[PDB]
Amino acid sequence: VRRLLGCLGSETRRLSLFLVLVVLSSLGEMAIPFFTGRLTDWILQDGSADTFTRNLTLMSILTIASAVLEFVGDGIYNNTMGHVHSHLQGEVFGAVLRQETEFFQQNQTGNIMSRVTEDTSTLSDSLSENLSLFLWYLVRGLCLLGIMLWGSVSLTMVTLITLPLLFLLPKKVGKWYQLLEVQVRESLAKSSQVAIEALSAMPTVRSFANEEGEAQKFREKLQEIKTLNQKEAVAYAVNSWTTSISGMLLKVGILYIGGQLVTSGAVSSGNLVTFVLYQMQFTQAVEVLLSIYPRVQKAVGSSEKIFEYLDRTPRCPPSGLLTPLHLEGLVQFQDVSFAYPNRPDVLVLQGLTFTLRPGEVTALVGPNGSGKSTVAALLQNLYQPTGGQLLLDGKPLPQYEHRYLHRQVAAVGQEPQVFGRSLQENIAYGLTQKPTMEEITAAAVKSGAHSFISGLPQGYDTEVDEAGSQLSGGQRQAVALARALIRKPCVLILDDATSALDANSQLQVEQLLYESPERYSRSVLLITQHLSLVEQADHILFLEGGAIREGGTHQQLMEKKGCYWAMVQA
Amino acid sequence: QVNNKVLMWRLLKLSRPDLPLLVAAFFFLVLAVLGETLIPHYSGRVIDILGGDFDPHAFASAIFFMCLFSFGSSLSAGCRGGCFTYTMSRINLRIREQLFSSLLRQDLGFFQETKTGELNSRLSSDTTLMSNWLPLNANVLLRSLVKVVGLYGFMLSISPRLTLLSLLHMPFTIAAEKVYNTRHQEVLREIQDAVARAGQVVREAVGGLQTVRSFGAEEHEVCRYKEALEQCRQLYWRRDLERALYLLVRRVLHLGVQMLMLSCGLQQMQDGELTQGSLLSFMIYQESVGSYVQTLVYIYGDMLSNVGAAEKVFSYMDRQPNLPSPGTLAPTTLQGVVKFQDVSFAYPNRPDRPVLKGLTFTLRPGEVTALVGPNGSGKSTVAALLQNLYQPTGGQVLLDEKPISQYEHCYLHSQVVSVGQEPVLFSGSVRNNIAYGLQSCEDDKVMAAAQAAHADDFIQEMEHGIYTDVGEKGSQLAAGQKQRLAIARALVRDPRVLILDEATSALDVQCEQALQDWNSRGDRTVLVIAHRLQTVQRAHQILVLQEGKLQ
Ligand SMILES: Nc1ncnc2c1ncn2[C@@H]1O[C@H](COP(=O)(O)OP(=O)(O)OP(=O)(O)O)[C@@H](O)[C@H]1O
Ligand SMILES: Nc1ncnc2c1ncn2[C@@H]1O[C@H](COP(=O)(O)OP(=O)(O)O)[C@@H](O)[C@H]1O
Ligand SMILES: [Mg+2]
Ligand SMILES: [Mg+2]
């Protein structure tokens, strides 16, 4: 694969050094059969003894140097593949989070994680082991064939001619083996389906008392299977015979041709000893190489499936480019109609018209199922309006930078979530830098977490689990309000903030919203069903469904005699 | 461990009739091994001849002995592999038949508490992976036992002095493996923890990305994932470093013996106690023993690890049934009376919640009764007690001054059959499903009993015979939605007592089975159950059921 090879491009210097060290180790490893032949011939020739003290020393130095260079080469290759695996897992993770929120839909939680965590590690482990073994044995197979041409020119032609005879016939008869084993496995599944069907209706079987009929029906399929596997045992007997006669008759032909060649005066008897010891090493080198090849062939196709997933393109705009100072904070909604990208054929929102002026309160109340939480998600950059204009200081949301905008607009969800970290880190989550210890306490006092977490023995450094076992419902909403308040945002959105939150915290959130001087620099939007909170709201909107039915202040809506009074008295 | 000993002894006793196949396989394995370790000895004989005065008589005789041992060893190895895979299939067919025959005599509490998918996996797939435990392990074990003895026997014949040099370094290989496997198991625990911490970040970020995207902290999850990847990387490098160091030590220790073996080989063969071909025979022999002794020392651990899959199959076969003790009856003449008193039956699956309370009623040979109940009051529950399908936990059912548990398995159910709201149609033909439960003598009774409901128009219109195939459930049945076929099945066996759970209904126009139309000829009792209170034509007894109570 071109792009997989192009991924491993910066490690060309280390890959070149690894190939050299493998060649130097493979050359030095083939020393013991190559030195057995001369020393045995030297005694039979009645030679001098001034070489035996040196030839054994030289042959031991070579394979010792081959052992170390194998260890150094295996050390480098294991180090470089580790950095590649760590780099590939990081980049496939960052490509996942860059897609739009439509792709997730709270249902791909299992398939995405199997594609990021499970497959990537198993693919790189298969690549790092099979390519290492394929490269090690290919060099050993090539080096042995290089020196077998040197020792003889006739016997090395014989073993190359009969090598396809060794490794093509067992494959062909092997194809006959599971061709008949397919029918045995198929008949085994068919017999089990009959027995299961006769067992699931057991009250019908027990009422008629026909267990002997089911025993005979099960036995008929077993006798047909017993006929079929008798041919299976014959097929393996032929298959196991022909993989063992070709291997051992090859050694006879090598020795007999060598027996004819030695007696002609071409090579000595000791040169045949080296060639005999090279046959068994070359045969296993070929056999290991052929078994490796199905593993790499399948794994390359799996890597092409991950690589096509890597270049998935999103549908949302990437980010913005403008960072201003002295933000106004007013956000204008003008003819905004939104449809869910899951089901674009049905419209779920249309005809919104309001303005969140700075320093005032605009709270919208609607019945159950009216679809108000999708409006608050539309306020930030979670989704996009299909046919409307969303204006924030004269500019749309994608025109602003992703990191700056969400630091300026903070919101809590209908169901707040708690990450498994320290509560000091979870309060200041998402911030560019960690603030001082006093600013966290100032944000926690305003939210009300300091009135409860002071009693905990762990202080502000308590460790919490993955999802809400240590913190209660009141505590989860208490740490959620502190999280959206530490950054001091310009637009604050609360969704069911006081649904389960305690009465003392519903108290001091009211002078914060209505009496505190900090409301002058923010524009707030509330979606709450509590009638004891929207009395001092400057703008009140009614969302019965789809679009706004009516809107106004507190006194105007009561004097109008609309649906707002009817919902209040209920 | 004593838990795996009882399962191994039962599994060994499961292969009792396959002893002649195991003996022949062991005999063919010994001959195949003996042929394999004899060719390298003859290989040293040819090199011995080639280095001296050449004579073609012994050289051709040596080659002819290579061919005779080559055909002999290949035929012995070929017949061994075929015989082993025939035993594997014959063992598999025996355990599968024994399991289903034992499972057919189990109570209905087992078939409703346990899913049918679980029984399918323990019958179709688990017994295939369980049957091949013995032929795979016996082939591996008996190969390494003979070959190690065979090769070391060939060691001592060549050179007793040079054998002991390679016999006194095997503890070095064993000590190297023992110290390496302990360190490798400790590192693997750390890798599993670090890969669990890496997955912890992905549980946090992917599942709650709505909170992450709404605060602009997607780069924080990317940065936090790099720390988890670096810790997994460092542990991966330590695992690869300790593995590569172990291979270097083992290869060096193996080399030092080979250098020492050859150095004593050249010195001994110089003086005249060895030949050139003897050294070649010793070198080829010595490389074979190194791998096979390592398989032999670690076969018991692999065998016990793979044997831990027969617990579920052996528990299903040997579990105790809940059926009561059967007995004999009087099948000479039957008076056709059923008596009932003080039922307090509850399901064994749910003994806490009862279904039927104390009620009594009787069935008469010349009378027909009716049972009416709105819903969930024991409509077909009473019908399950009469046919000995379920046994009461309170009170009993009588049949002419004797209970139902002492009746035999065959004659009681042949005289009492019933039809329900869901008539299950089994695989096969129409004739096989009309006369299900009958051993024989159906070839002269199907044509007179299938025309009970509305003669024959559904079957007579096509194929002009009863041999029309049906298939599985959900098939081409259109005779009143496979209801006409079920009632005609009931009247084949001419039972004395018939229970109709959800008969008549919209097919009450076909009323040839309720009154004298079926019963009242001689003595015959019919029990009728209806959902809505329809007026019982020619009624004799009216019973209305409400929460296990009747008026
Ligand atoms: N991802 C989604 N894609 C498509 N439709 C969705 C999706 N999530 C929710 N919905 C549906 O669209 C509706 C839009 O309503 P929305 O979620 O805005 O209401 P809500 O304010 O959360 O509800 P409530 O009345 O309980 O306060 C939901 O009630 C639900 O039926
Ligand atoms: N197979 C079963 N296993 C356990 N309880 C059952 C079973 N079938 C029915 N019951 C219980 O027995 C009560 C009576 O059911 P019943 O009226 O006999 O059903 P039907 O009307 O189908 O004959 C029901 O309330 C039900 O909860
Ligand atoms: Mg909502
Ligand atoms: Mg019923």
- How far, in Å, are A37, A166, A259, A283, B386 from residue A162 at the CA level? 25, 6, 18, 12, 78
Q: Cβ of B77 and A71 within 8 Å?
A: no
Query: Residue A344 CB: number of other CB atoms within 10 A?
Result: 9
Question: In this complex, which of A83, A196, A406 lies closest to B116 when CB atoms are compared?
Answer: A196
Question: Would you call B38 an interface residue with chain A, using a CB distance cutoff of 8 Å?
Answer: no
Same domain, A461 and A478: yes
Same domain, A185 and A260: yes
Any idea what DSSP says for residue A117?
I
Question: Would you call B55 an interface residue with chain A, using a CB distance cutoff of 8 Å?
Answer: no
Please give the Cα distance from B9 to A103 (Å, whole number): 56
- The residue whose CA has the least distance to atom 18 of ligand 2 is B378
Same domain, A8 and A117: yes
Instruction: Give the DSSP H/E element, type plus range, for residue B357.
Output: none
Q: Cβ of B82 and A237 within 8 Å?
A: yes
Same domain, A545 and A409: yes
Please give the Cα distance from A307 to A391 (Å, whole number): 39
Q: Are A494 and A373 in contact (CB under 8 A)?
A: no
Residue B206 identity: V
Same domain, A424 and A342: yes
Residue A372, ligand 1, Cβ within 6 A: yes
Decide the pairing of beta strands A361-365 and A539-542.
parallel
- Ligand whose nearest atom lies closest to the CA of B422: 4
- What is the CA(A374)–ligand 1 centre distance, in A? 7
Please give the Cα distance from B47 to B249 (Å, whole number): 34
Q: Are A309 and A328 in contact (CB under 8 A)?
A: no
User: Of A172, A233, A243, which Cα lies nearest the Cα of B80?
Assistant: A233
| A96 falls within a domain | yes
Longest CA–CA separation in chain B, Å? 120
**Backbone φ/ψ region at A135: left (φ over 0), alpha (ψ -120 to 50), beta:** alpha
Please give the Cα distance from A104 to A91 (Å, whole number): 19
| A466 falls within a domain | yes
| A354 falls within a domain | yes
Tokens of A371: 């679809």
| A207 falls within a domain | yes
Please give the Cα distance from A207 to A204 (Å, whole number): 5
Backbone angles phi, psi at A346, to 5 degrees: -115, 130
* Residues with Cβ within 8 Å of residue A73, at least 6 apart in sequence: A18, A21, A22, A25
Q: Are A539 and A533 in contact (CB under 8 A)?
A: no
- The residue whose CA has the least distance to atom 7 of ligand 1 is A340
Please give the Cα distance from B257 to B171 (Å, whole number): 13
Please give the Cα distance from A55 to B377 (Å, whole number): 100
User: Of B389, B315, B323, which Cα lies nearest the Cα of B119?
Assistant: B315
Please give the Cα distance from A401 to A395 (Å, whole number): 12
Instruction: Kindly report the CATH number assigned to the domain that includes residue A92.
Output: 1.20.1560.10
Tokens of A373: 């939480």
Residue B349, ligand 2, Cβ within 6 A: yes
* Residues with Cβ within 8 Å of residue B351, at least 6 apart in sequence: B393
Indicate the residue among A230, A246, A266 that finishes a domain: A266
Inter-axis angle of helices A269-310 and A52-96, nearest 10 = 10
Q: Cβ of B426 and A67 within 8 Å?
A: no
Any idea what DSSP says for residue A322?
B
Same domain, A366 and A512: yes
Any idea what DSSP says for residue A364?
E
Decide the pairing of beta strands B541-546 and B549-550.
antiparallel
In chain B, residues 347-376 whose CB comes closer than 8 Å to chain A = none
Count how many Cα atoms sit within 13 Å of the Cα of residue A152 in the half-sphere of its side chain: 28
Residue B216 identity: G
- How many helices (DSSP H) and strands (DSSP E) are in chain A? 22, 9
Distance from CA of A563 to the nearest CA of B (A): 34
The structure tokens 């007894």 sit at B541
Backbone angles phi, psi at B249, to 5 degrees: -70, -45
Residue A368, ligand 1, Cβ within 6 A: yes
Mutate to test the pocket of ligand 1, among A372, A378, A493, A543 (most ligand atoms within 8 A of CB): A372
DSSP per-residue string spanning A36-47: HHHHHHHHHTT-
| A339 falls within a domain | yes
**Backbone φ/ψ region at B338: left (φ over 0), alpha (ψ -120 to 50), beta:** beta
Q: Is A369 annotated among the ligand-binding residues?
A: yes
The structure tokens 């027909």 sit at B368
Backbone angles phi, psi at A95, to 5 degrees: -75, -25
Same domain, A534 and A410: yes
Q: Burial level of A462, CB count in 10 A (0-12/13-18/19+)?
A: middle
Backbone angles phi, psi at B241, to 5 degrees: -75, -40
Q: Are B324 and B512 in contact (CB under 8 A)?
A: no
Q: Burial level of A293, CB count in 10 A (0-12/13-18/19+)?
A: exposed
Count how many Cα atoms sit within 13 Å of the Cα of residue B88 in the half-sphere of its side chain: 22
| A22 falls within a domain | yes
- Most B CBs within 10 Å, among A56, A83, A187, A188, to test the B interface: A188
Query: Residue A158 CB: number of other CB atoms within 10 A?
Result: 16
Mutate to test the pocket of ligand 1, among A102, A347, A348, A499 (most ligand atoms within 8 A of CB): A348
Please give the Cα distance from B345 to B355 (Å, whole number): 7
Report the b/e string of A53-69 with b at 16+ CB within 10 A: eeebeebbebbbbbbeb
* Residues with Cβ within 8 Å of residue B225, at least 6 apart in sequence: A90, A93, B198, B201, B202, B205
Question: Would you call B31 an interface residue with chain A, using a CB distance cutoff of 8 Å?
Answer: no
Please give the Cα distance from B171 to B151 (Å, whole number): 19
- Indicate the SS3 state at residue B487: helix
Same domain, A262 and A274: no
What's the angle, vertex CA A395, arms to CA A390 and CA A397, rounded to 5?
55
Q: Are A39 and A57 in contact (CB under 8 A)?
A: no
Query: Residue B362 CB: number of other CB atoms within 10 A?
Result: 14
Tokens of B535: 């007026």
Q: Is B376 annotated among the ligand-binding residues?
A: yes
- What is the CA(B355)–ligand 2 centre distance, in A? 8
Q: Are A361 and A537 in contact (CB under 8 A)?
A: yes
The structure tokens 């006739």 sit at A154
CATH fold of B325-551:
Rossmann fold (3.40.50)
**Backbone φ/ψ region at B538: left (φ over 0), alpha (ψ -120 to 50), beta:** left
Please give the Cα distance from B457 to B479 (Å, whole number): 9
Decide the pairing of beta strands B338-341 and B361-363.
antiparallel
List residues, by chain if needed, whose CB lies under 5 Å from ion ligand 3. A 373
Count how many Cα atoms sit within 13 Å of the Cα of residue B211 in the half-sphere of its side chain: 20
Please give the Cα distance from B492 to B442 (Å, whole number): 8
Q: What is the resolution of this structure in A?
A: 3.7
Q: Is B331 annotated among the ligand-binding residues?
A: no
User: Of B173, B423, B368, which Cα lies nearest the Cα of A201?
Assistant: B423
* Residues with Cβ within 8 Å of residue B426, at least 6 apart in sequence: A197, A198, A201, B432, B433, B436
Chain A CB contacts of B407 under 8 Å are: none
Residue B108 identity: L
Instruction: Give the DSSP H/E element, type plus range, for residue B498.
Output: strand B497-500
Residue numbers of the domain that contains A232: 164-266
Please give the Cα distance from B142 to A292 (Å, whole number): 28
The structure tokens 């329809």 sit at B534
Inter-axis angle of helices B276-297 and B170-207, nearest 10 = 40
Tokens of B508: 């009450």
Q: Are A269 and B51 in contact (CB under 8 A)?
A: yes
Please give the Cα distance from B9 to A50 (Å, whole number): 65
CATH fold of B3-159+274-318:
ABC transporter transmembrane region fold (1.20.1560)
User: What are the residue ranges of helices labelled H in B380-512?
Assistant: 381-386, 411-415, 430-434, 446-449, 484-490
* Residues with Cβ within 8 Å of residue A120, at least 6 apart in sequence: A88, A89, A92, A306
Q: Are A482 and A427 in contact (CB under 8 A)?
A: yes
- Ligand whose nearest atom lies closest to the CA of A376: 1
Distance from CA of A542 to the nearest CA of B (A): 25
Please tell me the total count of domains within chain A: 3
User: What are the residue ranges of helices labelled H in B368-468?
Assistant: 381-386, 411-415, 430-434, 446-449
CA distance from start to end of chain A = 68
User: Of A505, A516, A418, A513, which Cα lies nearest the Cα of A470?
Assistant: A418
Residue B109, ligand 2, Cβ within 6 A: no
Tokens of A418: 């708690």
| A421 falls within a domain | yes
Please give the Cα distance from B169 to B256 (Å, whole number): 10
- What is the CA(B401)–ligand 4 centre distance, in A? 29
- How far, in Å, are A418, A462, A476, A478, A481 from residue A425 at the CA level? 11, 10, 14, 15, 14
CA distance from start to end of chain B = 64
* Residues with Cβ within 8 Å of residue A38, at least 6 apart in sequence: A55, A270
* Residues with Cβ within 8 Å of residue B189, at least 6 apart in sequence: none
- Most A CBs within 10 Å, among B28, B43, B74, to test the A interface: B74
Decide the pairing of beta strands A409-411 and B497-500.
unpaired
Beta bridge partners of A365: A542
- Indicate the SS3 state at residue A522: coil
Decide the pairing of beta strands B338-341 and A523-527.
unpaired
Please give the Cα distance from B355 to B344 (Å, whole number): 8
Beta bridge partners of B546: B549
Contacts of A26-30 with C-beta under 8 Å, sequence gap 24+, read A26/A66, A26/A139, A26/A140, A26/A143, A27/A66, A27/A143, A28/A62, A28/A63, A28/A65, A28/A66, A28/A69, A29/A63, A29/A66, A29/A70, A29/A140, A30/A140, A30/A143, A30/A144, A30/A147, A30/A281
- What is the CA(B204)–ligand 1 centre distance, in A? 23
Chain B CB contacts of A262 under 8 Å are: 50
Chain CA centroid to CA B336, Å: 44
- How far, in Å, are B16, B32, B299 from residue B143 at the CA level? 22, 9, 12
> In residues, how long is chain B?
551
- How far, in Å, are A295, A482, B343, B522 from residue B418 at the CA level? 60, 71, 20, 20
Please report, for chain B, the start and end positions of each structural domain, with discontinuous segments joined by +.
Answer: 3-159+274-318, 167-248, 325-551
Please give the Cα distance from A159 to A190 (Å, whole number): 48
Q: Are B493 and B304 in contact (CB under 8 A)?
A: no
| A323 falls within a domain | no
Same domain, A3 and A122: yes
Contacts of B323-327 with C-beta under 8 Å, sequence gap 24+, read B323/B105, B323/B107, B324/B391, B324/B405, B325/B405, B326/B405, B326/B406, B326/B407, B326/B408, B326/B409, B327/B405, B327/B406, B327/B407, B327/B408
Q: Are B503 and B513 in contact (CB under 8 A)?
A: yes
Any idea what DSSP says for residue A389?
E
Instruction: Give the DSSP H/E element, type plus range, for residue A362.
Output: strand A361-365
- Most B CBs within 10 Å, among A85, A241, A374, to test the B interface: A241
User: Of B283, B296, B263, which Cα lies nearest the Cα of B173?
Assistant: B296
Report the b/e string of A89-124 with b at 16+ CB within 10 A: bbebbeebbebebeebeeeeeeebbebbbebbbebb
Query: Residue A308 CB: number of other CB atoms within 10 A?
Result: 10
Chain A CB contacts of B79 under 8 Å are: 237
Residue B369, ligand 2, Cβ within 6 A: no
Distance from CA of A252 to the nearest CA of B (A): 7
Q: Cβ of B283 and A36 within 8 Å?
A: yes
Q: Solved how?
A: cryo-EM
Same domain, A288 and A235: no
Same domain, A258 and A288: no
The structure tokens 């199905």 sit at A294
Residue B304 identity: L
Q: Are B518 and B512 in contact (CB under 8 A)?
A: yes
Detail the DSSP E strand segments found in B142-249: none
- The residue whose CA has the least distance to atom 25 of ligand 2 is B376
- How far, in Å, are A30, A451, A462, A476, B455 from residue A456 at the CA level? 71, 10, 8, 15, 85
Longest CA–CA separation in chain A, Å? 128
Any idea what DSSP says for residue B387?
T
The structure tokens 């032999």 sit at B296
